[PDB]
């Protein structure tokens with residue numbers, strides 16, 4: 079059976095790997111860009127390679143082994159460091175200078191955590207259909223008895239750090255039932271390890287690919303003709319007997335099946351035209367789910383002016399404006415020679431910032447930095463890097479987020495195949511949507527569904 | 541039966557009135573503040589009275605008569621004016637100076653309206669249980685095929701003026717099924733009339749109260765002992781046999797029933813302790829619904845520097861920061877020669893702003909207006925009024941908003957009685973939550989439910 083796999087990110091490479099494993103080796107993997115890895119992708123910044131996309135193996139040291147972890151920590155030995163959030167309370171900056179009192183912040187953090195813990199008990203009881211779901215925010219109100227959620231500068235940046243920094247949209251839009259507690263952590267463990275290796279976290283994808291695609295003996299570059307880069311799929315026609323796929327350079331390919339691994343943002347954008355058009359139930363499922371954006375703004379400075387030391391890796395800025403340049407990280411461990419800082423924004427701020435110059439963004443950030451460090455002589459960043467994933471037509475965002483309003487059945491419709499067209503990718507991961515491991519496992523699952531129909535002539539889905 | 545009514549806003553007054561008409565006259569209305577009217581409340585600013593709360597009669601000229609209308613326009617003849625939004629396309633300002641090309645903006649507005657129209661069609665086809673509901677934003681993504689809703693400054697301010705300015709929260713949190721289309725406009729008509737009368741929109745409430753409460757023959761002041769101001773209920777105990785209500789000043793009253801008209805934000809706050817605690821289902825329905833905040837920032841200037849004339853009443857500021865001081869209104873008709881502007885903000889901006897000084901807010905607003913009218917010498921406002929409804933313990937917000945996730949059944953639970961504890965108010969309105977006519981009809985509906993149960997034992 080010939081299978082065309084659209085996209086060579088983690089899930090498309092993972093899906094193809096599993097099909098190969100089932101002996102389905104007549105494969106054609108069409109990747110839009112000139113490389114594989116998708117959302118796991120590094121870039122040079124300031125003399126070092128930093129990750130524009132995924133940066134952590136999240137969910138480590140728990141009861142089950144996160145399948146990505148061994149690859150990273152053992153097989154490839156990708157350099158990495160466990161992130162420690164224990165010292166956050168000593169690192170929350172006032173809008174107008176200096177940090178707040180540690181004990182005061184610690185109390186606010188413990189309050190926020192206990193609300194979430196009560197949230198997990200409610201969640202366990204909600205009807206499985208997802209019909210009684212509510213936003214994380216509704217749960218926060220319920221639990222603290224207030225007509226609003228965190229609303230002071232400190233509580234809002236703690237809230238932003240707890241939720242938005244993980245999910246990339248606010249609690250008020252996020253599904254309680256599907257995120258608190260979160261399976262990644264319940265299953266795999268609470269820790270997260272930040273990868274900081276010149277080869278890039280994407281080395282994981284190259285590794286998996288090389289397990290079934292031919293590579294050059296001296297360079298180890300993949301040379302298998304089954305992988306074709308710079309091929310942007312723009313049309314998929316499918317019928318009872320087969321499928322035909324066309325790329326922008328006009329190539330046309332045929333197969334028994336197609337496995338689509340493009341992001342939910344790409345599916346929301348209409349880059350790929352389906353013929354016939356996908357069914358309405360499928361179209362609605364696609365638009366109802368959220369594709370979030372998480373912008374990692376790196377900055378390079380001619381000298382250090384922030385704290386380094388125990389518990390200094392992560393720090394927050396308590397702006398009176400929610401989500402305004404709030405979550406900071408310094409790299410004394412990851413990039414010691416560097417002088418780099420990383421401030422993370424998402425959602426509304428991400429869209430605003432992608433739409434303006436990097437210089438304008440640098441200037442807003444320098445204003446924030448000077449306020450945080452009024453006692454220092456804060457030099458201007460000599461370099462800044464603003465990833466623009468939402469604007470990139472091959473991604474249209476960074477990762478899915480389960481919103482209040484998408485029920486269990488609607489989420490199944492988002493993954494469901496349509497004739498010979500199958501879907502895979504992080505947004506199709508039943509319990510790990512939004513993660514590299516979620517992409518990895520979604521690839522195997524989608525492939526298996528396809529294997530069933532193709533090899534076991536079991537084609538009915540659900 | 542003796543009934544205690546908590547609060548003398550529109551719904552309390554209205555419910556007490558319906559009870560009275562049913563013969564239930566042994567009433568005790570306990571109001572926290574020193575006056576009746578609640579969310580319909582005026583104040584003097586720059587020598588004129590402007591409305592801190594509700595300002596329009598929304599839904600006029602349609603298939604059915606909005607009950608508030610005749611009272612406003614025929615009974616009391618409060619001075620008012622139809623708002624016309626037709627010229628908006630000529631009044632949308634760029635973040636850094638001047639207005640956008642009118643034809644361009646007019647097309648963005650039509651696109652927005654067309655998307656909403658399609659949402660209305662979609663909405664009509666959603667299962668009644670609410671299982672297919674989605675946010676207005678999800679409908680926008682679906683209808684235009686994008687991974688996001690309005691996202692350029694101009695599209696965002698139009699989006700804000702179309703939804704947040706009505707609902708006080710963004711489309712991404714709002715239930716499509718329960719807001720588009722909106723009953724208030726579908727039933728009562730598309731027009732809205734801005735009330736600008738010195739007696740205040742609140743006159744409507746005073747007139748209602750006066751139909752059954754006693755007032756001084758000279759004064760005209762309500763002097764009925766059944767109305768007690770400055771009574772802040774802090775505790776309501778109930779049993780199968782009656783209820784007891786305690787006030788912050790230590791009074792204690794007893795009755796057969798209690799009708800709670802305090803806002804949803806009040807109920808979400810714990811200012812009133814129920815003993816025993818309300819059931820879990822009630823409490824959940826309460827915290828699930830949203831209590832939105834809409835802040836009307838009035839400003840006074842030594843002279844005008846903004847446009848006046850046909851279509852100039854309403855204008856937008858398209859900041860690249862969504863919802864930042866974006867919706868403006870000038871009062872050439874309402875308050876001639878006063879030199880007052882009104883900029884409206886809600887939700888996140890309302891809470892941030894209520895937490896900072898008026899002076900800080902004034903300064904932010906002056907930077908904006910200077911950006912909007914670079915060609916002018918813009919004087920600093922001489923006076924500013926920043927209402928703080930969210931911060932006010934007796935309101936905790938301005939009006940409810942229906943969030944995605946809540947279905948009709950959970951909404952209905954919000955209105956349900958608990959034993960002898962009845963509830964009324966805008967958040968209990970079957971089809972008009974969030975409005976004055978909604979508080980009005982809610983009072984009558986809640987009262988009739990109590991009447992049937994108490995008097996016919998048909999609960």
Ligand SMILES: [C][N][C][C][C][N][C][C][C][N][C][C][C]([O])N1=C2C(=O)[N]C(=O)N=C2N([C][C]([O])[C]([O])[C]([O])[C]OP([O])(=O)OP([O])(=O)O[C][C]2O[C](N3[C]=NC4=C3N=[C]N=C4[N])[C]([O])[C]2[O])C2=[C]C([C])=C([C])[C]=C21
Pocket residue numbers: 084085086087088089090108109110111114115116117118130131132133134135136243244245263268270309310311312339340341344349350372373374467472473475476477502503504505512513514515516517
């Ligand atoms: C408990 N405690 C905790 C603390 C907290 N922390 C915080 C931090 C976290 N945050 C969140 C997250 C982030 O960071 N990131 C990440 C990480 O880190 N980790 C993980 O896991 N993850 C993440 N993410 C996500 C990821 O990356 C994803 O999911 C994946 O990767 C996905 O994959 P898939 O599904 O496969 O997809 P992609 O990659 O996209 O692929 C696809 C492909 O396809 C292609 N195309 C398109 N279209 C087309 C094509 N071809 C052809 N034709 C056509 N048409 C493309 O190109 C590709 O390749 C993340 C992400 C991101 C981005 C970021 C920024 C971040 C993150």
Ligand SMILES: [C][N][C][C][C][N][C][C][C][N][C][C][C]([O])N1=C2C(=O)[N]C(=O)N=C2N([C][C]([O])[C]([O])[C]([O])[C]OP([O])(=O)OP([O])(=O)O[C][C]2O[C](N3[C]=NC4=C3N=[C]N=C4[N])[C]([O])[C]2[O])C2=[C]C([C])=C([C])[C]=C21
Pocket residue numbers: 546547548549550551552570571572573576577578579580592593594595596597598705706707725730731732771772773774801802803806811812834835836929933934935937938939964965966967974975976977978979
């Ligand atoms: C188509 N075209 C259209 C265009 C659009 N434009 C935009 C405009 C609109 N916006 C939105 C709305 C607003 O404006 N507003 C209004 C108006 O105008 N109108 C209407 O209708 N409405 C409105 N609003 C709402 C109203 O006001 C409400 O709903 C009502 O009033 C409510 O009533 P009720 O329910 O009865 O409530 P209140 O008043 O609150 O009352 C209660 C009472 O109680 C008391 N308390 C409390 N706590 C307590 C007590 N007592 C005793 N004890 C205790 N503990 C209080 O004090 C009271 O009196 C509105 C509103 C507002 C606020 C604003 C600002 C605005 C608005």
Ligand SMILES: *[C@@H]1O[C@H](CO)[C@@H](O[C@@H]2O[C@H](CO)[C@@H](O)[C@H](O)[C@H]2NC(C)=O)[C@H](O)[C@H]1NC(C)=O
Pocket residue numbers: 138139151152
């Ligand atoms: C990540 O990988 C390292 C690499 O081995 C692990 O550290 C080794 O663990 C084995 C297990 O006992 C020891 O015999 C080695 O002495 C350890 N090596 C070093 C350099 O300490 C490590 O535990 C892994 N971390 C996680 C979280 O799995």
Ligand SMILES: *[C@@H]1O[C@H](CO)[C@@H](O)[C@H](O)[C@H]1NC(C)=O
Pocket residue numbers: 600601613614
């Ligand atoms: C409002 O009242 C005036 C007073 O008679 C009347 O002329 C006018 O047509 C009324 N407008 C509406 C919308 O009823």
